[PDB]
Design a protein around this nucleic acid. Sequence first.
RNA 1: UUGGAGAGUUUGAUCCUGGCUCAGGGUGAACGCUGGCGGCGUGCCUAAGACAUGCAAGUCGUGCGGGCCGCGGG
Length: 148
Amino acid sequence: DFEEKMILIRRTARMQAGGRRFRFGALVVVGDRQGRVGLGFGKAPEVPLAVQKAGYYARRNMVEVPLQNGTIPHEIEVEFGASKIVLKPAAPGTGVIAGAVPRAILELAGVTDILTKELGSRNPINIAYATMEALRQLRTKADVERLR
RNA sequence: UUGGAGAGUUUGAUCCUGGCUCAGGGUGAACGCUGGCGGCGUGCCUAAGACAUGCAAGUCGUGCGGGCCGCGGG
Ligand SMILES: [Mg+2]
Ligand SMILES: [Mg+2]
Ligand SMILES: [Mg+2]
Ligand SMILES: [Mg+2]
Ligand SMILES: [Mg+2]
Ligand SMILES: [Mg+2]
Ligand SMILES: [Mg+2]
Ligand SMILES: [Mg+2]
Ligand SMILES: [Mg+2]
Ligand SMILES: [Mg+2]
Ligand SMILES: [Mg+2]
Ligand SMILES: [Mg+2]
Ligand SMILES: [Mg+2]
Ligand SMILES: [Mg+2]
Ligand SMILES: [Mg+2]
């Protein structure tokens, strides 16, 4: 079936009379390596539940992302509030050029060759959301002349 | 169209802002520890401070008159 990757685990904290009491946040992308990716954020009182909870939501938030010989059809920039991802198509023999967060998303979508660059807040979460919305806005020639 | 990776650190925790710091590459280098050979580079970045000694620009007797020495006789 699909394939999972844990980009982010982190411990948060709330306060009460007595001290700090913790939660856990799991940021996990799930892909098909052939054009299906999803991103999910799952928060739970212990690490396994969250890691498992996020993979659930991930499977219910997928994007088409239409590959073209392993690369995306056009350059794209998306801002998710102070976070900014740039994606540029790249020829075959180049590789996936991305930091760890967008890499896990592109590599699970079957992107084999792309140029990326994060800008502004490189906050992993918001960068991950902005990478997903970037893929969500990918158009093809058949997509655009149908629109026109 | 051959080209673009980020991370640590302000909070109990969050998002943002922002500075500091790090991973890379480079040097006519220097310093420490260590040191086998070969090739090709390359070596006063400071006092354009001061310098012993030798050498780094001479050559033509097919321009000219001469002193010397050596070779053939007058
Ligand atoms: Mg499409
Ligand atoms: Mg902005
Ligand atoms: Mg942001
Ligand atoms: Mg910043
Ligand atoms: Mg940061
Ligand atoms: Mg500190
Ligand atoms: Mg403060
Ligand atoms: Mg602290
Ligand atoms: Mg910073
Ligand atoms: Mg020897
Ligand atoms: Mg000098
Ligand atoms: Mg000197
Ligand atoms: Mg002086
Ligand atoms: Mg001489
Ligand atoms: Mg002479």
